[PDB]
Amino acid sequence: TKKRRNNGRAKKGRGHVQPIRCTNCACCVPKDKAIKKFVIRNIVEAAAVRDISEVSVFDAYVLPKLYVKLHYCVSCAIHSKVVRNRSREARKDRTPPP
Amino acid sequence: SLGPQVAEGENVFGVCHIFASFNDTFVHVTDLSGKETICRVTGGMKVKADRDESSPYAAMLAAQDVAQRCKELGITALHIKLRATGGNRTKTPGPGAQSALRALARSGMKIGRIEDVTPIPSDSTRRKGGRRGRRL
Amino acid sequence: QPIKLARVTKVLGRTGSQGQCTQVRVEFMDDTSRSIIRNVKGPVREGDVLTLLESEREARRL
Amino acid sequence: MRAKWRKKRMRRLKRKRRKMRQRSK
Amino acid sequence: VVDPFSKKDWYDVKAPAMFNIRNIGKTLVTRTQGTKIASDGLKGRVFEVSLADLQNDEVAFRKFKLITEDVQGKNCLTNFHGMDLTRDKMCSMVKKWQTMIEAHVDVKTTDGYLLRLFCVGFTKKRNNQIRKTSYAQHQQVRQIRKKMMEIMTREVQTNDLKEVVNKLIPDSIGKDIEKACQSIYPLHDVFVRKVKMLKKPKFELGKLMELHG
RNA sequence: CGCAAGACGGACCAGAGCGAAAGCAUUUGCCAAGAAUGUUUUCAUUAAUCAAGAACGAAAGUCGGAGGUUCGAAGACGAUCAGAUACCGUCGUAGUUCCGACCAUAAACGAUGCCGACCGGCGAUGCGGCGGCGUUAUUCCCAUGACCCGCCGGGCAGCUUCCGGGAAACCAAAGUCUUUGGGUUCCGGGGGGAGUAUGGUUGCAAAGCUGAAACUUAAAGGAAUUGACGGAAGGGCACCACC
RNA sequence: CCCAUGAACGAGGAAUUCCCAGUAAGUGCGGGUCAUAAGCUUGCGUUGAUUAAGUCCCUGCCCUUUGUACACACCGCCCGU
């Protein structure tokens, strides 16, 4: 039986979308279908923002962040626990989780 | 092995190209140019096992041996050009990244501009693994 | 580096694999407005004094 | 027996019938 | 059994006079031991210098390439080779739910230096904008792109390599474009993300020495 | 630091747009094309759907050139394994790319023919038009952009409702059906045998289009419920569990 | 019961059991068996701690959500040579 209205993916009036490669695996996945997750992330977490800022030649030097748009294979994503299975009620929730 | 620098005030800068892939970590200090090298030691040099070439310890222990050698040659400070594998493969730097930075800062050196120089492309050649990818 | 004393000002919860370490905020005895989160192995209530072989290490919040 | 492989088997079986039929020509 | 850093000679590096903080850093070379000269083996050396360790105190995310055209004696005399933006900044600017607008201009200064100036622009979500998207039409994009190319030609073709670097330092081209293109689509995060040399003219020694007092 | 070649067009990139479908993403120019809106323009039934016939038709595959970066059917190894002609790894020919000629098939899917009428509500979005306080730019007014608040048409959608339908899942269409007739094309008739044999036809080939019978069979199947089960996800308890 | 003989055993590999207060462990004494009769069990005192007041890491079990072609139900069904 038809599980999703939007057949997993997000194309409505296309017919074809360019595929991307899942990052964990490397499997050809349609762009709209893929679980895209954008990650801004400090080059050092907490243990080193203490130590590196102390040895900062500078005075009041902000650190850079690392900007990587991850794509994911549906298997890629669920094994990596990015997306969980939800109840047939809670499948219809599209709001990104708090 | 002496950069004849003005007693204290001068920080003599290098640049440690930290290439942290997911099965090795390279700490490699050069001049401001990049065209002349000072010291390279990688994770796999300082561990007797292929398993822990990637390791954050290996990266730490290499970065310490970099710092040791860079004290001698009269480099006070470094700039950091952190690098992941890049191209059609991952943009994310492996687990040796943080430990290496933390290490060489923690183990003597002074730190200038950190930035990512991970090789990224407009559109790539086809990635390793098939249609269906790396099935396991 | 010296060995700094610290005061258990709030016991937060419980960390570790087997729930083997309480997580705690420790008010430093020198700087009475430095309060860091630190993992403690063994029974601890409010106000007992922990000896830290370094104060630069810091526990991740559960 | 996946239906694609049943077809492939039956397709290669048909290819071995335009071999035994190709001798009388 | 012999340390190769025993053979090395520590040259100081000097940036041209348009910049405020003069000396950059150090560069070790092999001593002229035989045929190949240290001065000869110290020419095509790109120095990837951040601006805030090149001016007094300006925006830091901008970099500059300086190559050692001439080597006098414990002084690597360098010349502008190409401005670039920090991946940190360039990535931070690229947000979803707005139109990116890139341009690029093959251009020549009054002195025979040939440049490829790459501009980038981003449409601004307005003060009271309740609608989520902030996208241009395609004609809006290409009219903006046409003004970017018009301005980058207009402010490189007319004057020398020395002046155009003195324009690239504070933010002349990036801000002039953003003032010009408000009437087409109001865009906000406008920079000249990259500059690169294509043809340097035949090197005149006194022309570099001009840029070092 | 350069040089060369060939692929590919990240991020921007959306349940966004365009296209009959397949499909389509660097810049700029040329070329014809196109829907939608606007219209107190024109022709005046010219129309809807369609045996025959026809155009386009992913990928793979075939023939003759050009090129061969990456990736990689076959193959050579290296592991895992009881075996492992597989999953994993290193090489790797055809191929992947371009040109000319085939081939005409895909879960070519919205698994939903096209045209037309009618029957709910809601806020969005894309295109055009029309109207309305205000802010901003070309500042020197305009008028145009950018927001803002509405309305109209056309489109891709979404949420919601005891419209109604349906075996249900679900569908503003899959409704307006025993209260059964708006027009029309294709097409199904229990499961297998079988998309097989055979004949024709198209193709260089691989194959495609048309396509049975004997025989065999009491079920095969659809949706949903409960349970058990999982080498799925999360929560909880226990010194017959751990610390 | 008496006298003699006086073995391995010097703290136990892989693994694994039991247990938070009068508890574990040490120590004896009753009951059952019993003509004869405790290295067993079932009770009873006596002496009396270490550690813990935790968690879901391991092992089980239980829920909730999911998937299923399973329903004497995964020791299930099941495909080809």
mmCIF file of N, CA and C (backbone and C1' of nucleotides) in Angstrom, chain F residues 14-55:
data_model
loop_
_atom_site.group_PDB
_atom_site.id
_atom_site.type_symbol
_atom_site.label_atom_id
_atom_site.label_comp_id
_atom_site.label_asym_id
_atom_site.label_seq_id
_atom_site.Cartn_x
_atom_site.Cartn_y
_atom_site.Cartn_z
ATOM 1 P P A F 14 17.463 22.090 -1.888
ATOM 2 O "O5'" A F 14 16.150 22.939 -1.566
ATOM 3 C "C5'" A F 14 14.836 22.395 -1.814
ATOM 4 C "C4'" A F 14 13.768 23.429 -1.544
ATOM 5 C "C3'" A F 14 12.325 23.007 -1.844
ATOM 6 O "O3'" A F 14 11.435 23.425 -0.811
ATOM 7 C "C1'" A F 14 12.864 24.953 -3.069
ATOM 8 P P G F 15 11.232 22.516 0.495
ATOM 9 O "O5'" G F 15 10.121 21.472 0.049
ATOM 10 C "C5'" G F 15 8.811 21.934 -0.293
ATOM 11 C "C4'" G F 15 8.472 21.504 -1.695
ATOM 12 C "C3'" G F 15 7.116 21.987 -2.183
ATOM 13 O "O3'" G F 15 7.298 23.191 -2.910
ATOM 14 C "C1'" G F 15 7.301 19.626 -2.433
ATOM 15 P P A F 16 6.132 24.278 -2.973
ATOM 16 O "O5'" A F 16 6.542 25.158 -4.238
ATOM 17 C "C5'" A F 16 7.537 24.705 -5.180
ATOM 18 C "C4'" A F 16 8.085 25.865 -5.975
ATOM 19 C "C3'" A F 16 7.979 25.731 -7.493
ATOM 20 O "O3'" A F 16 6.695 26.094 -7.993
ATOM 21 C "C1'" A F 16 10.212 26.166 -6.933
ATOM 22 P P G F 17 6.106 25.327 -9.265
ATOM 23 O "O5'" G F 17 6.972 25.917 -10.458
ATOM 24 C "C5'" G F 17 6.953 27.322 -10.720
ATOM 25 C "C4'" G F 17 7.890 27.645 -11.851
ATOM 26 C "C3'" G F 17 7.603 26.940 -13.165
ATOM 27 O "O3'" G F 17 6.611 27.652 -13.889
ATOM 28 C "C1'" G F 17 9.894 26.739 -12.660
ATOM 29 P P C F 18 5.610 26.871 -14.849
ATOM 30 O "O5'" C F 18 6.572 26.362 -16.006
ATOM 31 C "C5'" C F 18 7.073 27.302 -16.961
ATOM 32 C "C4'" C F 18 8.115 26.661 -17.838
ATOM 33 C "C3'" C F 18 7.658 25.507 -18.709
ATOM 34 O "O3'" C F 18 6.880 25.918 -19.826
ATOM 35 C "C1'" C F 18 9.712 24.961 -17.715
ATOM 36 P P G F 19 5.551 25.109 -20.208
ATOM 37 O "O5'" G F 19 6.134 23.783 -20.866
ATOM 38 C "C5'" G F 19 6.805 23.853 -22.131
ATOM 39 C "C4'" G F 19 7.623 22.608 -22.372
ATOM 40 C "C3'" G F 19 6.857 21.314 -22.586
ATOM 41 O "O3'" G F 19 6.211 21.246 -23.857
ATOM 42 C "C1'" G F 19 8.710 20.915 -21.177
ATOM 43 P P A F 20 4.601 21.216 -23.939
ATOM 44 O "O5'" A F 20 4.245 19.766 -23.396
ATOM 45 C "C5'" A F 20 2.894 19.281 -23.417
ATOM 46 C "C4'" A F 20 2.884 17.773 -23.512
ATOM 47 C "C3'" A F 20 3.932 17.037 -22.682
ATOM 48 O "O3'" A F 20 3.558 16.886 -21.315
ATOM 49 C "C1'" A F 20 3.918 16.164 -24.870
ATOM 50 P P A F 21 4.669 16.995 -20.166
ATOM 51 O "O5'" A F 21 5.484 15.638 -20.311
ATOM 52 C "C5'" A F 21 5.084 14.454 -19.597
ATOM 53 C "C4'" A F 21 5.605 13.228 -20.299
ATOM 54 C "C3'" A F 21 7.068 12.896 -20.049
ATOM 55 O "O3'" A F 21 7.331 12.308 -18.786
ATOM 56 C "C1'" A F 21 6.650 12.739 -22.341
ATOM 57 P P A F 22 8.645 12.717 -17.995
ATOM 58 O "O5'" A F 22 9.802 12.093 -18.889
ATOM 59 C "C5'" A F 22 9.922 10.668 -18.979
ATOM 60 C "C4'" A F 22 10.949 10.283 -20.013
ATOM 61 C "C3'" A F 22 12.373 10.776 -19.782
ATOM 62 O "O3'" A F 22 13.109 9.958 -18.875
ATOM 63 C "C1'" A F 22 11.773 11.149 -22.028
ATOM 64 P P G F 23 14.054 10.612 -17.760
ATOM 65 O "O5'" G F 23 14.315 12.086 -18.301
ATOM 66 C "C5'" G F 23 15.615 12.482 -18.782
ATOM 67 C "C4'" G F 23 15.527 13.687 -19.695
ATOM 68 C "C3'" G F 23 16.170 14.959 -19.169
ATOM 69 O "O3'" G F 23 17.568 14.968 -19.412
ATOM 70 C "C1'" G F 23 14.012 15.473 -19.937
ATOM 71 P P C F 24 18.565 15.603 -18.334
ATOM 72 O "O5'" C F 24 18.269 17.162 -18.448
ATOM 73 C "C5'" C F 24 18.511 17.881 -19.670
ATOM 74 C "C4'" C F 24 18.082 19.322 -19.523
ATOM 75 C "C3'" C F 24 18.602 20.068 -18.302
ATOM 76 O "O3'" C F 24 19.930 20.548 -18.507
ATOM 77 C "C1'" C F 24 16.294 20.492 -18.561
ATOM 78 P P A F 25 20.929 20.729 -17.267
ATOM 79 O "O5'" A F 25 20.422 22.079 -16.586
ATOM 80 C "C5'" A F 25 20.707 23.370 -17.164
ATOM 81 C "C4'" A F 25 21.374 24.276 -16.150
ATOM 82 C "C3'" A F 25 22.698 23.769 -15.570
ATOM 83 O "O3'" A F 25 23.627 24.830 -15.424
ATOM 84 C "C1'" A F 25 21.193 24.233 -13.818
ATOM 85 P P U F 26 24.680 25.139 -16.576
ATOM 86 O "O5'" U F 26 25.333 26.504 -16.084
ATOM 87 C "C5'" U F 26 25.304 26.881 -14.696
ATOM 88 C "C4'" U F 26 26.346 27.937 -14.421
ATOM 89 C "C3'" U F 26 26.324 29.153 -15.337
ATOM 90 O "O3'" U F 26 25.399 30.142 -14.887
ATOM 91 C "C1'" U F 26 28.516 28.286 -15.258
ATOM 92 P P U F 27 24.610 31.071 -15.941
ATOM 93 O "O5'" U F 27 25.756 31.993 -16.543
ATOM 94 C "C5'" U F 27 26.291 33.110 -15.819
ATOM 95 C "C4'" U F 27 27.218 33.890 -16.714
ATOM 96 C "C3'" U F 27 26.588 34.451 -17.982
ATOM 97 O "O3'" U F 27 25.909 35.694 -17.761
ATOM 98 C "C1'" U F 27 28.577 33.310 -18.544
ATOM 99 P P U F 28 24.463 35.994 -18.434
ATOM 100 O "O5'" U F 28 24.829 36.626 -19.849
ATOM 101 C "C5'" U F 28 25.905 37.566 -20.016
ATOM 102 C "C4'" U F 28 26.527 37.414 -21.386
ATOM 103 C "C3'" U F 28 25.565 37.296 -22.556
ATOM 104 O "O3'" U F 28 24.979 38.544 -22.912
ATOM 105 C "C1'" U F 28 27.239 35.665 -22.788
ATOM 106 P P G F 29 23.477 38.598 -23.469
ATOM 107 O "O5'" G F 29 23.647 38.231 -25.009
ATOM 108 C "C5'" G F 29 24.407 39.073 -25.891
ATOM 109 C "C4'" G F 29 24.778 38.327 -27.150
ATOM 110 C "C3'" G F 29 23.630 37.811 -28.000
ATOM 111 O "O3'" G F 29 22.980 38.853 -28.726
ATOM 112 C "C1'" G F 29 25.270 36.132 -27.822
ATOM 113 P P C F 30 21.396 38.791 -29.006
ATOM 114 O "O5'" C F 30 21.285 37.794 -30.244
ATOM 115 C "C5'" C F 30 22.036 38.017 -31.452
ATOM 116 C "C4'" C F 30 22.122 36.754 -32.282
ATOM 117 C "C3'" C F 30 20.802 36.100 -32.648
ATOM 118 O "O3'" C F 30 20.155 36.786 -33.713
ATOM 119 C "C1'" C F 30 22.297 34.442 -31.892
ATOM 120 P P C F 31 18.557 36.890 -33.741
ATOM 121 O "O5'" C F 31 18.114 35.371 -33.929
ATOM 122 C "C5'" C F 31 18.437 34.674 -35.148
ATOM 123 C "C4'" C F 31 18.112 33.200 -35.061
ATOM 124 C "C3'" C F 31 16.687 32.814 -34.708
ATOM 125 O "O3'" C F 31 15.763 33.057 -35.762
ATOM 126 C "C1'" C F 31 18.165 31.407 -33.550
ATOM 127 P P A F 32 14.776 34.322 -35.696
ATOM 128 O "O5'" A F 32 13.449 33.714 -35.059
ATOM 129 C "C5'" A F 32 12.466 33.054 -35.872
ATOM 130 C "C4'" A F 32 12.443 31.571 -35.591
ATOM 131 C "C3'" A F 32 11.381 31.105 -34.608
ATOM 132 O "O3'" A F 32 10.063 31.226 -35.126
ATOM 133 C "C1'" A F 32 13.392 30.047 -34.064
ATOM 134 P P A F 33 8.915 31.850 -34.202
ATOM 135 O "O5'" A F 33 8.688 30.706 -33.115
ATOM 136 C "C5'" A F 33 8.468 29.346 -33.535
ATOM 137 C "C4'" A F 33 8.523 28.394 -32.368
ATOM 138 C "C3'" A F 33 7.527 28.653 -31.250
ATOM 139 O "O3'" A F 33 6.196 28.327 -31.640
ATOM 140 C "C1'" A F 33 9.621 28.160 -30.309
ATOM 141 P P G F 34 4.971 29.239 -31.148
ATOM 142 O "O5'" G F 34 4.827 28.837 -29.615
ATOM 143 C "C5'" G F 34 4.662 27.461 -29.234
ATOM 144 C "C4'" G F 34 4.746 27.315 -27.737
ATOM 145 C "C3'" G F 34 3.875 28.257 -26.925
ATOM 146 O "O3'" G F 34 2.525 27.818 -26.907
ATOM 147 C "C1'" G F 34 6.033 28.233 -26.002
ATOM 148 P P A F 35 1.323 28.876 -26.899
ATOM 149 O "O5'" A F 35 0.719 28.713 -25.436
ATOM 150 C "C5'" A F 35 0.455 27.413 -24.881
ATOM 151 C "C4'" A F 35 0.768 27.404 -23.406
ATOM 152 C "C3'" A F 35 -0.017 28.385 -22.546
ATOM 153 O "O3'" A F 35 -1.347 27.949 -22.296
ATOM 154 C "C1'" A F 35 2.251 28.457 -21.921
ATOM 155 P P A F 36 -2.552 28.990 -22.396
ATOM 156 O "O5'" A F 36 -2.295 29.953 -21.153
ATOM 157 C "C5'" A F 36 -2.358 29.469 -19.792
ATOM 158 C "C4'" A F 36 -1.800 30.488 -18.817
ATOM 159 C "C3'" A F 36 -2.391 31.896 -18.859
ATOM 160 O "O3'" A F 36 -3.592 31.967 -18.100
ATOM 161 C "C1'" A F 36 -0.042 32.045 -18.827
ATOM 162 P P U F 37 -4.928 32.591 -18.726
ATOM 163 O "O5'" U F 37 -4.822 34.136 -18.365
ATOM 164 C "C5'" U F 37 -4.689 34.578 -17.004
ATOM 165 C "C4'" U F 37 -3.832 35.822 -16.951
ATOM 166 C "C3'" U F 37 -4.407 37.058 -17.624
ATOM 167 O "O3'" U F 37 -5.322 37.694 -16.742
ATOM 168 C "C1'" U F 37 -2.148 36.790 -18.254
ATOM 169 P P G F 38 -6.582 38.458 -17.328
ATOM 170 O "O5'" G F 38 -5.914 39.553 -18.260
ATOM 171 C "C5'" G F 38 -5.396 40.764 -17.703
ATOM 172 C "C4'" G F 38 -4.999 41.684 -18.819
ATOM 173 C "C3'" G F 38 -6.098 41.969 -19.830
ATOM 174 O "O3'" G F 38 -7.017 42.924 -19.308
ATOM 175 C "C1'" G F 38 -4.040 41.534 -20.936
ATOM 176 P P U F 39 -8.594 42.721 -19.528
ATOM 177 O "O5'" U F 39 -8.743 42.887 -21.105
ATOM 178 C "C5'" U F 39 -8.410 44.148 -21.707
ATOM 179 C "C4'" U F 39 -8.386 44.065 -23.214
ATOM 180 C "C3'" U F 39 -9.575 43.409 -23.892
ATOM 181 O "O3'" U F 39 -10.686 44.302 -23.932
ATOM 182 C "C1'" U F 39 -7.551 42.766 -24.964
ATOM 183 P P U F 40 -12.005 44.034 -23.060
ATOM 184 O "O5'" U F 40 -13.165 44.553 -24.022
ATOM 185 C "C5'" U F 40 -13.512 43.782 -25.188
ATOM 186 C "C4'" U F 40 -13.885 44.663 -26.355
ATOM 187 C "C3'" U F 40 -12.768 45.520 -26.954
ATOM 188 O "O3'" U F 40 -12.709 45.296 -28.353
ATOM 189 C "C1'" U F 40 -14.675 46.854 -26.455
ATOM 190 P P U F 41 -11.932 44.026 -28.916
ATOM 191 O "O5'" U F 41 -10.862 44.685 -29.894
ATOM 192 C "C5'" U F 41 -11.203 45.120 -31.221
ATOM 193 C "C4'" U F 41 -10.228 44.565 -32.229
ATOM 194 C "C3'" U F 41 -10.731 43.389 -33.043
ATOM 195 O "O3'" U F 41 -11.560 43.859 -34.103
ATOM 196 C "C1'" U F 41 -8.593 42.871 -32.208
ATOM 197 P P U F 42 -12.930 43.109 -34.471
ATOM 198 O "O5'" U F 42 -12.455 41.975 -35.483
ATOM 199 C "C5'" U F 42 -11.597 42.286 -36.594
ATOM 200 C "C4'" U F 42 -10.879 41.046 -37.064
ATOM 201 C "C3'" U F 42 -11.757 39.837 -37.346
ATOM 202 O "O3'" U F 42 -12.316 39.923 -38.649
ATOM 203 C "C1'" U F 42 -9.936 39.174 -36.001
ATOM 204 P P C F 43 -13.780 39.369 -38.922
ATOM 205 O "O5'" C F 43 -13.541 37.810 -39.117
ATOM 206 C "C5'" C F 43 -12.738 37.317 -40.202
ATOM 207 C "C4'" C F 43 -12.489 35.835 -40.042
ATOM 208 C "C3'" C F 43 -13.710 34.965 -39.768
ATOM 209 O "O3'" C F 43 -14.381 34.633 -40.979
ATOM 210 C "C1'" C F 43 -11.952 34.364 -38.298
ATOM 211 P P A F 44 -15.964 34.805 -41.099
ATOM 212 O "O5'" A F 44 -16.522 33.689 -40.112
ATOM 213 C "C5'" A F 44 -16.198 32.303 -40.309
ATOM 214 C "C4'" A F 44 -16.468 31.524 -39.044
ATOM 215 C "C3'" A F 44 -17.943 31.283 -38.727
ATOM 216 O "O3'" A F 44 -18.142 29.963 -38.248
ATOM 217 C "C1'" A F 44 -16.913 32.427 -36.933
ATOM 218 P P U F 45 -19.166 29.000 -38.992
ATOM 219 O "O5'" U F 45 -18.922 27.607 -38.262
ATOM 220 C "C5'" U F 45 -17.779 26.804 -38.599
ATOM 221 C "C4'" U F 45 -17.441 25.858 -37.473
ATOM 222 C "C3'" U F 45 -18.525 24.853 -37.091
ATOM 223 O "O3'" U F 45 -17.958 23.570 -36.828
ATOM 224 C "C1'" U F 45 -17.952 26.160 -35.211
ATOM 225 P P U F 46 -17.520 22.606 -38.042
ATOM 226 O "O5'" U F 46 -16.065 23.130 -38.435
ATOM 227 C "C5'" U F 46 -14.919 22.804 -37.625
ATOM 228 C "C4'" U F 46 -13.772 23.761 -37.875
ATOM 229 C "C3'" U F 46 -12.693 23.760 -36.801
ATOM 230 O "O3'" U F 46 -11.766 22.710 -37.043
ATOM 231 C "C1'" U F 46 -13.171 25.984 -37.580
ATOM 232 P P A F 47 -10.760 22.261 -35.893
ATOM 233 O "O5'" A F 47 -11.678 22.210 -34.595
ATOM 234 C "C5'" A F 47 -11.392 23.029 -33.456
ATOM 235 C "C4'" A F 47 -12.317 22.652 -32.336
ATOM 236 C "C3'" A F 47 -12.055 21.296 -31.697
ATOM 237 O "O3'" A F 47 -10.994 21.364 -30.752
ATOM 238 C "C1'" A F 47 -14.340 21.464 -32.203
ATOM 239 P P A F 48 -9.954 20.155 -30.615
ATOM 240 O "O5'" A F 48 -10.726 19.121 -29.687
ATOM 241 C "C5'" A F 48 -11.193 19.495 -28.379
ATOM 242 C "C4'" A F 48 -11.902 18.332 -27.709
ATOM 243 C "C3'" A F 48 -11.228 16.961 -27.798
ATOM 244 O "O3'" A F 48 -10.190 16.808 -26.826
ATOM 245 C "C1'" A F 48 -13.474 16.747 -28.441
ATOM 246 P P U F 49 -8.720 16.249 -27.239
ATOM 247 O "O5'" U F 49 -8.991 14.693 -27.425
ATOM 248 C "C5'" U F 49 -9.616 13.963 -26.369
ATOM 249 C "C4'" U F 49 -10.210 12.675 -26.868
ATOM 250 C "C3'" U F 49 -9.274 11.738 -27.603
ATOM 251 O "O3'" U F 49 -8.393 11.079 -26.696
ATOM 252 C "C1'" U F 49 -11.327 11.877 -28.762
ATOM 253 P P C F 50 -7.103 10.311 -27.251
ATOM 254 O "O5'" C F 50 -7.763 9.110 -28.064
ATOM 255 C "C5'" C F 50 -7.089 8.503 -29.170
ATOM 256 C "C4'" C F 50 -8.077 7.911 -30.141
ATOM 257 C "C3'" C F 50 -7.446 7.326 -31.396
ATOM 258 O "O3'" C F 50 -7.062 5.979 -31.132
ATOM 259 C "C1'" C F 50 -9.209 8.792 -32.002
ATOM 260 P P A F 51 -5.934 5.265 -32.013
ATOM 261 O "O5'" A F 51 -6.765 4.676 -33.231
ATOM 262 C "C5'" A F 51 -6.088 3.941 -34.256
ATOM 263 C "C4'" A F 51 -6.749 2.605 -34.456
ATOM 264 C "C3'" A F 51 -6.124 1.747 -35.553
ATOM 265 O "O3'" A F 51 -5.058 0.926 -35.080
ATOM 266 C "C1'" A F 51 -8.375 2.105 -36.075
ATOM 267 P P A F 52 -3.539 1.213 -35.540
ATOM 268 O "O5'" A F 52 -3.688 1.687 -37.057
ATOM 269 C "C5'" A F 52 -4.015 0.751 -38.107
ATOM 270 C "C4'" A F 52 -4.017 1.430 -39.460
ATOM 271 C "C3'" A F 52 -2.689 2.032 -39.901
ATOM 272 O "O3'" A F 52 -1.807 1.057 -40.438
ATOM 273 C "C1'" A F 52 -4.444 3.561 -40.343
ATOM 274 P P G F 53 -0.278 1.055 -39.996
ATOM 275 O "O5'" G F 53 0.184 2.554 -40.286
ATOM 276 C "C5'" G F 53 0.372 3.041 -41.634
ATOM 277 C "C4'" G F 53 0.620 4.536 -41.642
ATOM 278 C "C3'" G F 53 1.770 5.031 -40.781
ATOM 279 O "O3'" G F 53 3.043 4.839 -41.381
ATOM 280 C "C1'" G F 53 -0.105 6.403 -40.411
ATOM 281 P P A F 54 4.330 4.688 -40.450
ATOM 282 O "O5'" A F 54 4.390 6.090 -39.691
ATOM 283 C "C5'" A F 54 4.961 7.241 -40.344
ATOM 284 C "C4'" A F 54 4.729 8.514 -39.558
ATOM 285 C "C3'" A F 54 5.631 8.759 -38.355
ATOM 286 O "O3'" A F 54 6.944 9.145 -38.765
ATOM 287 C "C1'" A F 54 3.408 9.374 -37.821
ATOM 288 P P A F 55 8.258 8.675 -37.942
ATOM 289 O "O5'" A F 55 8.518 9.897 -36.955
ATOM 290 C "C5'" A F 55 8.798 11.212 -37.471
ATOM 291 C "C4'" A F 55 8.565 12.254 -36.406
ATOM 292 C "C3'" A F 55 9.402 12.117 -35.138
ATOM 293 O "O3'" A F 55 10.713 12.650 -35.319
ATOM 294 C "C1'" A F 55 7.146 12.480 -34.557
#
